[PDB]
């Protein structure tokens, strides 16, 4: 840590290059105009809502990088690519209506959207897909995904895909903030991929929501502690220009011993109270601190501000970020919350339009009007032409790509097409995939493949001596390692999912890791990646509750399924085969990245178990894209049932089908379910347009296109609600499931199978017990199979196990 | 950051206490009994699982703790609280053996735990509540989980609740793990909370999964920097004893800076060669390094071990650890991952018999035997001795609490089961539930409110004048402030809901915050939370996708309901009323804290909008709890429906219920669902019950045994699921679901609902098209109804929008 004043002292500070009392008059029309849109909705009483206090404190700092530092998007690259500070959005709005981005209707429609001419609360791409870029009001999520963003920057650089060196990545971050584990956790990555392309800025105006960050301590001091421990460049930007002279005259060293001990707690206290109570209990402290401002007028001494509301001292800080290689740049910026609304922290807007030498006249200050520059005048010009030098306005947003990608056709998977005559595994035949995509000279390098440590539990080893991994082992490595790191894993992906977007340069991210630590873990993410409008695979790993045996309750997933399909731009699969596999692939990547561009991204879970995988059912193609198909038909005379299954549990699912038919003459159509989720949605799709439309020909769910009324079972390897949300669309008047709810645990497939009661002897039990409520067969031919299957009809139900 | 060598110079290492021979003797069989475990395992050939290079790294470092710093749980505290680092639980179970706490079959069922008389590849306490503690297997949860854990015993003395002076925390980390933004995201905490009762051991052998953390790098120097850089002590076990006569002789000081250049990469090549390669190629690098092993024999040079394999230098970390005061110490121990085992990380298991001395003939070897130690053998009599001077055996857990608490009846909150003056939210009647339990005399100390920076959002400046903020605003504060940290506050809440296995002590967590930040954003501690046998509540605040109306993407909650019903024993429910909290409220705290001791923590979503809250109907106390009951009967003439609804949907569906009533005679039952979940648990008990009882009489689904045949119409604030999960249950033939799903937007609560097709039109214009096809009314009225309530058909499915 170093004393509490600013890091650049004045002699080492540059010449401000602006006009500075031009600057102010433009700011103090966007201050007036962000208010303003706060107000208007707050006066409609809909519990709107919107923030006012943040943006005052930080009003100054966006203002000198609009003015002199943010390069917008431009032919070249993405520009600058700022993570806005979720909450202060209304400044941002109010300066793109100044810049005549927005109108004044839509201003006064701030949070009011779904009509179709407003503004989004927060920064939201899917709401508002050409202003917004990045998600950033979950707080924490900024910090981390700006980490990465910056080093997928560098990425394109050394992998010679694109030149993206003039680009800077700008976090700009609360002080509150940066108290989420997410915040300060990957900080360290910065200093190991000397990721000088990357600053933070973080708004110390030591407060957050409820009170000070740490009120008996100096939240600056912590940070600076922390990040130049990390290997960060850190710059304090702690105090105005008024200081100078003070500090300047003070050779007793005084005046920093009494900066450094004061407590944040205290200053908030000062800048409640008056200039008398600051002479008194701060400077009034030592007789040579108080003989520094004897000479001065209480009015003089209360003028003292902070530093990030000084524009020479902003720039100094932004302009030393810009030279400093190597490492990252931190910048703190002090600041107070609820500058100048004074009490407010109708006639107190009044103050705030004095305070700024607002022009707004007084017998008009009631209809809170907007304030705007006409073409022409000093200030509209001036606005214009820094943007101008500055390659245009930000933020602003690309929907779609302009390239023309020639993809793999389903042929190019041919192999895996076949029967396969060795065993292998859905995550071999996931791999085997990936390779044909590496052999595609339009998209073999624009694959982004990462991996969360975890190769060798995938066999990824051998794409490493075939295309390597990124290590600035070299720079033009194509493989992502991010360690034990899910979320920086994840962030990593979601800058190569929006590739298409920010750098109109479309990168392919395969994400595989161990499903269990997916959406369970990051989730947060994921649902920002939904807003991004990310589009790349996920590949949950060692997926299946009883699968992944031995690894028990943290590791067997069976439930990451029912977490995906809460995020309605996510497409979830459970493929059984290594040919549902390529056709699930191939699929995505042509709805993703091929002329539709859809937004959308794919979650499909694989598995680590070897099986014989047979050759795919001519026709069966759209089948398995829509969610489901059938497999055969198997003959018997003394009754017909329906056998559903998916991911690991489907082989077993048609090894009961074998069952009934040989030792019970039921015979029965058996179907793979690639996608349960997407069969609930088509359904909830048809149903929801039937209500809607009640004297036209209703809609069929494409389930009940394939599936037929004869009594069913469903098994797979997560919980029951997985196979059950489908079925109001099923067409049978029973529909039995099975699945695997409960706490996983240790032990052979065999064993967690019986106990999570869904291998075969429990579907044969599930559908002898339909059989025998219509009356087909005799109720003890049920009890016997439960004995002769070893079947313990009373231990507790697994849930509660 | 310092030196590449011991923090600790030898002139200040005490002397070490311990028979350094009779101890290596006992740890050889620990280390062989753990390898026997595994390979036995492994022998199966069922891919079982399990590590054996981790535990060879790291068996001294535990080793030392068990003899000389472990205290076990005893009459006074809970004994120190370690959290074991997940994969090297075979050691654990190996040295439990010796101390004859394990017998030889249970480690025979080395990851079988399905019948009931093995063991769990990881700490699970769910899996052995008698044997496990803390679930730390998900990496970087057991380093912040254990920050809040040292954090809450402080709170525990301060509050003067329990004298937890004599325990220490320690969390035994990886140095992969390390990278996990939870692990290193919360360490200014430890500083701000001056927590020197808790020491972070990391095993730094340099190595992860697939290769080094940061082979290009020096991880320990990494991590010095941080911890340093956030206010810890920081104790570095570099090199082991036989390196100190070579410092000292060294006097060009080429050594440290020899050590200091070398890379982590380069170590670990070092590792893997022999003396004659690290003399030429370490000290080889300079004459005077060269020099000072000039003398020595290459078998001497490759002698040389790392400190975390020297007893005398943990010893010392452990010690200096233990004094210190004011700050949380952190010990980097360097390790050899694989130690000892040569060849890989019966040729095999000769050697290592070899290696470290194993008293196993070769005529047993074949048999992969378990070692013992005999009573009356010098062995047995002094591991049992240590263990005994630090009051008995870890780890260890106690299931239940013992003291009788005396908890509030359902009369004494009373006054919430009566209707309302005002209007008010389920937020408010939660806050006015924790006040009837604050003047509890039994329970009212042992509260512990969570806030995590929302405080003033959820109206509880109340409850700081009447029971404070603790802050050691002071010490004997008894609300918990963990700041914008979600993760954090979880951990807290755990910690606390985990008390009375711990500590003997219940402590009843009350944790309130912004619902989408819920299981979305540490679903993973969640999950763990259920492994540790939490009990408490989670309260999620402002939830509902349309009723937080202005906040708008990443904060209108309209699924963690569907993520919360992912865990085994998390009880959700989603009340509308004052009364339905108040009921649930008790029940949880009964169900947890009373005499049951049920192991299960309960969510409860509340809300921000006010409105009427009626009387609690006489007798429907049991319907609550149990998940539905039925609210009132409508007549009508021209039809009848059944109408549920949750949440703030209710009050919607029951205003659709007059109007269906008034205006079209449609009569209907109206139902409030506090809890489809619980419903649909007790759906699927009973069709599972049913499946394995073929001869026995079908139970009954409760929800069916309240509704019936009716059509009915269900809505809520959630996705479509929600309600649809108990569509197998419900005994009506037509059974319409609205819901929430798509992603949330800004606007009022009026356009929210009509948007997502949840309001009072919908439910309306839902249960007449099921009148309609079933012939009672005319298809022109369903149409005529979408006119008359401005509903367009043909926007897009919200899902989509
Ligand atoms: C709904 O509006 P809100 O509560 O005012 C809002 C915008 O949602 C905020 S703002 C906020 C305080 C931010 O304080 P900081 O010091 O970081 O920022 P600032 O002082 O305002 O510059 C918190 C905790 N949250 C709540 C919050 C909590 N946790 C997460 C993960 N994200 C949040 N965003
Ligand atoms: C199936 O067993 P596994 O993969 O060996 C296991 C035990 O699951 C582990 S162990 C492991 C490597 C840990 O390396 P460290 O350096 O931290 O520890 P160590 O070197 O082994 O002393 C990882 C990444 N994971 C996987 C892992 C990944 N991500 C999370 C969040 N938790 C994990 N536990
Ligand atoms: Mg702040
Ligand atoms: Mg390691």
Same mark, same amino acid.
């Given at each position: 840590?170093?004393?509490?004043?600013?890091?650049?002292?004045?002699? %080492?500070?540059?010449?401000?290059?602006?006009?500075?009392?031009?600057?102010?008059?433009?700011?103090?029309?966007?201050?007036?105009?962000?208010?303003?849109?706060?107000?208007?909705?707050?006066?409609?009483?809909?519990?709107?809502?919107?923030?006012?206090?943040?943006?005052?404190?930080?009003?100054?700092?966006?203002?000198?990088?609009?003015?002199?530092?943010?390069?917008?998007?431009?032919?070249?690259?993405?520009?600058?690519?700022?993570?806005?500070?979720?909450?202060?959005?209304?400044?941002?709005?109010?300066?793109?209506?100044?810049?005549?981005?927005?109108?004044?209707?839509?201003?006064?429609?701030?949070?009011?959207?779904?009509?179709? !001419?407003?503004?989004?609360?927060?920064?939201?791409?899917?709401?508002?897909?050409?202003?917004?870029?990045f998600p950033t009001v979950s707080m924490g999520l900024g910090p981390i995904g700006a980490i990465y963003q910056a080093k997928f920057?560098?990425?394109?650089?050394?992998?010679?895909?694109?030149?993206?060196?003039?680009?800077?990545?700008?976090?700009?971050?609360?002080?509150? %903030?940066?108290?989420?584990?997410?915040?300060?956790?990957?900080?360290?990555?910065?200093?190991?991929?000397?990721?000088?392309?990357?600053?933070?800025?973080?708004?110390?105006?030591?407060?957050?929501?409820?009170?000070?960050?740490?009120? !008996?301590?100096?939240?600056?001091?912590?940070?600076?502690?922390?990040?130049?421990?990390?290997?960060?460049?850190?710059?304090?930007?702690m105090w105005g220009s008024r200081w100078d002279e003070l500090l300047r005259k003070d050779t007793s060293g005084k005046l920093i011993?009494?900066?450094?001990?004061?407590?944040?707690?205290?200053?908030?206290?000062?800048?409640?109270?008056?200039?008398?109570?600051?002479?008194?209990?701060?400077?009034?402290?030592?007789?040579?601190?108080? &003989?520094?401002?004897?000479?001065?007028?209480?009015?003089?001494?209360?003028?003292?501000?902070?530093?990030?509301?000084?524009?020479?001292?902003?720039?100094?800080?932004?302009?030393?970020?810009?030279?400093?290689?190597?490492?990252?740049?931190?910048?703190?910026?002090?600041?107070?919350?609820?500058?100048?609304?004074?009490? &407010?922290?109708?006639?107190?807007?009044?103050?705030?339009?004095?305070?700024?030498?607002?022009?707004?006249?007084?017998?008009?200050?009631?209809?809170?009007?907007?304030?705007?520059?006409?073409?022409?005048?000093?200030?509209?010009?001036?606005?214009?032409?820094?943007?101008?030098?500055?390659?245009?306005?930000?933020?602003?947003?690309?929907?779609?790509?302009?390239?023309?990608?020639?993809?793999?056709?389903?042929?190019?998977?041919?192999?895996?097409?076949?029967?396969?005559?060795?065993?292998?595994?859905?995550?071999?035949?996931?791999?085997?995939?990936?390779?044909?995509?590496?052999?595609?000279?339009?998209?073999?390098?624009?694959?982004?493949?990462?991996?969360?440590?975890?190769?060798?539990?995938?066999?990824?080893?051998?794409?490493?001596?075939?295309?390597?991994?990124?290590?600035?082992?070299? %720079?033009?490595? @194509?493989?992502?390692?991010?360690?034990?790191?899910?979320?920086?894993?994840?962030?990593?992906?979601?800058?190569?999912?929006?590739?298409?977007?920010?750098?109109?340069?479309?990168?392919?991210?395969?994400?595989?890791?161990?499903?269990?630590?997916?959406?369970?873990?990051?989730?947060?993410?994921?649902?920002?990646?939904?807003?991004?409008?990310?589009?790349?695979?996920?590949?949950?790993?060692?997926?299946?509750?009883?699968?992944?045996?031995?690894?028990?309750?943290?590791?067997?997933?069976?439930?990451?399924?029912? @977490?995906?399909?809460?995020?309605?731009?996510?497409?979830?699969?459970?493929?059984?085969?290594?040919?549902?596999?390529?056709?699930?692939?191939?699929?995505?990547?042509?709805?993703?990245?091929?002329?539709?561009?859809?937004?959308?991204?794919?979650?499909?879970?694989?598995?680590?178990?070897?099986?014989?995988?047979?050759?795919?059912?001519?026709?069966?193609?759209?089948?398995?894209?829509?969610?489901?198909?059938?497999?055969?038909?198997?003959?018997?005379?003394?009754?017909?049932?329906?056998?559903?299954?998916?991911?690991?549990?489907?082989?077993?699912?048609?090894?009961?089908?074998?069952?009934?038919?040989?030792?019970?003459?039921?015979?029965?159509?058996?179907?793979?379910?690639?996608?349960?989720?997407?069969?609930?949605?088509?359904?909830?799709?048809?149903?929801?347009?039937?209500?809607?439309?009640?004297?036209?020909?209703?809609?069929?769910?494409?389930? &009940?296109?394939?599936?037929?009324?004869?009594?069913?079972?469903?098994?797979?390897?997560?919980?029951?609600?997985?196979?059950?949300?489908?079925?109001?669309?099923?067409?049978?008047?029973?529909?039995?499931?099975?699945?695997?709810?409960?706490?996983?645990?240790?032990?052979?497939?065999?064993?967690?199978?019986?106990?999570?009661?869904?291998?075969?002897?429990?579907?044969?039990?599930?559908?002898?017990?339909?059989?025998?409520?219509?009356?087909?067969?005799?109720?003890?031919?049920? &009890?016997?199979?439960?004995?002769?299957?070893?079947?313990?009809?009373?231990?507790?139900?697994?849930?509660?196990?």
């Amino acid at each position: 840590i170093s004393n509490y004043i600013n890091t650049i002292p004045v002699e %080492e500070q540059p010449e401000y290059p602006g006009n500075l009392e031009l600057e102010r008059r433009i700011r103090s029309a966007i201050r007036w105009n962000a208010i303003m849109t706060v107000l208007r909705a707050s006066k409609k009483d809909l519990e709107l809502g919107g923030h006012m206090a943040s943006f005052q404190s930080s009003a100054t700092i966006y203002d000198v990088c609009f003015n002199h530092f943010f390069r917008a998007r431009n032919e070249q690259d993405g520009g600058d690519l700022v993570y806005f500070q979720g909450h202060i959005s209304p400044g941002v709005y109010a300066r793109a209506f100044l810049e005549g981005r927005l109108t004044q209707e839509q201003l006064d429609n701030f949070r009011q959207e779904v009509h179709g !001419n407003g503004l989004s609360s927060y920064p939201h791409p899917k709401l508002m897909p050409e202003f917004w870029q990045f998600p950033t009001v979950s707080m924490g999520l900024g910090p981390i995904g700006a980490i990465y963003q910056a080093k997928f920057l560098k990425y394109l650089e050394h992998r010679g895909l694109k030149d993206t060196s003039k680009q800077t990545v700008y976090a700009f971050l609360g002080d509150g %903030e940066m108290d989420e584990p997410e915040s300060k956790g990957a900080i360290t990555i910065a200093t190991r991929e000397k990721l000088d392309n990357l600053v933070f800025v973080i708004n110390c105006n030591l407060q957050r929501l409820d009170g000070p960050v740490t009120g !008996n301590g100096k939240i600056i001091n912590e940070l600076e502690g922390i990040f130049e421990g990390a290997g960060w460049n850190v710059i304090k930007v702690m105090w105005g220009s008024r200081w100078d002279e003070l500090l300047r005259k003070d050779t007793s060293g005084k005046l920093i011993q009494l900066m450094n001990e004061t407590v944040d707690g205290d200053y908030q206290t000062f800048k409640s109270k008056d200039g008398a109570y600051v002479r008194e209990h701060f400077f009034g402290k030592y007789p040579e601190t108080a &003989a520094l401002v004897a000479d001065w007028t209480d009015e003089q001494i209360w003028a003292l501000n902070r530093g990030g509301h000084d524009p020479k001292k902003i720039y100094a800080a932004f302009k030393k970020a810009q030279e400093t290689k190597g490492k990252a740049t931190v910048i703190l910026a002090h600041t107070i919350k609820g500058y100048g609304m004074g009490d &407010a922290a109708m006639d107190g807007v009044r103050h705030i339009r004095d305070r700024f030498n607002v022009p707004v006249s007084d017998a008009d200050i009631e209809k809170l009007p907007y304030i705007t520059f006409p073409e022409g005048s000093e200030e509209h010009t001036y606005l214009h032409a820094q943007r101008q030098k500055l390659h245009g306005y930000l933020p602003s947003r690309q929907p779609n790509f302009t390239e023309k990608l020639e993809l793999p056709s389903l042929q190019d998977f041919g192999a895996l097409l076949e029967e396969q005559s060795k065993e292998i595994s859905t995550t071999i035949a996931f791999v085997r995939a990936l390779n044909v995509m590496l052999k595609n000279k339009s998209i073999k390098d624009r694959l982004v493949p990462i991996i969360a440590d975890e190769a060798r539990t995938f066999g990824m080893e051998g794409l490493f001596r075939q295309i390597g991994i990124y290590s600035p082992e070299d %720079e033009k490595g @194509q493989i992502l390692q991010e360690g034990i790191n899910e979320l920086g894993a994840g962030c990593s992906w979601l800058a190569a999912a929006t590739s298409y977007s920010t750098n109109n340069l479309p990168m392919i991210p395969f994400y595989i890791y161990y499903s269990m630590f997916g959406f369970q873990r990051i989730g947060d993410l994921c649902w920002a990646a939904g807003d991004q409008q990310a589009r790349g695979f996920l590949i949950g790993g060692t997926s299946g509750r009883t699968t992944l045996n031995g690894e028990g309750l943290q590791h067997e997933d069976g439930h990451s399924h029912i @977490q995906s399909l809460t995020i309605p731009n996510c497409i979830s699969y459970d493929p059984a085969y290594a040919y549902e596999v390529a056709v699930i692939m191939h699929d995505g990547l042509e709805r993703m990245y091929g002329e539709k561009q859809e937004n959308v991204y794919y979650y499909i879970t694989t598995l680590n178990e070897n099986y014989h995988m047979p050759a795919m059912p001519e026709g069966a193609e759209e089948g398995i894209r829509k969610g489901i198909y059938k497999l055969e038909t198997i003959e018997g005379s003394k009754g017909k049932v329906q056998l559903l299954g998916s991911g690991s549990i489907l082989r077993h699912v048609r090894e009961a089908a074998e069952i009934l038919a040989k030792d019970y003459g039921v015979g029965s159509d058996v179907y793979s379910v690639t996608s349960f989720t997407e069969l609930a949605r088509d359904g909830q799709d048809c149903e929801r347009w039937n209500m809607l439309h009640p004297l036209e020909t209703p809609r069929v769910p494409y389930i &009940a296109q394939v599936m037929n009324d004869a009594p069913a079972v469903a098994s797979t390897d997560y919980m029951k609600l997985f196979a059950e949300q489908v079925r109001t669309y099923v067409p049978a008047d029973d529909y039995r499931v099975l699945g695997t709810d409960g706490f996983g645990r240790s032990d052979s497939r065999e064993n967690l199978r019986h106990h999570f009661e869904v291998d075969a002897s429990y579907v044969v039990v599930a559908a002898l017990g339909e059989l025998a409520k219509r009356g087909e067969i005799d109720k003890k031919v049920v &009890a016997d199979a439960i004995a002769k299957f070893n079947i313990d009809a009373d231990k507790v139900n697994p849930r509660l196990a």
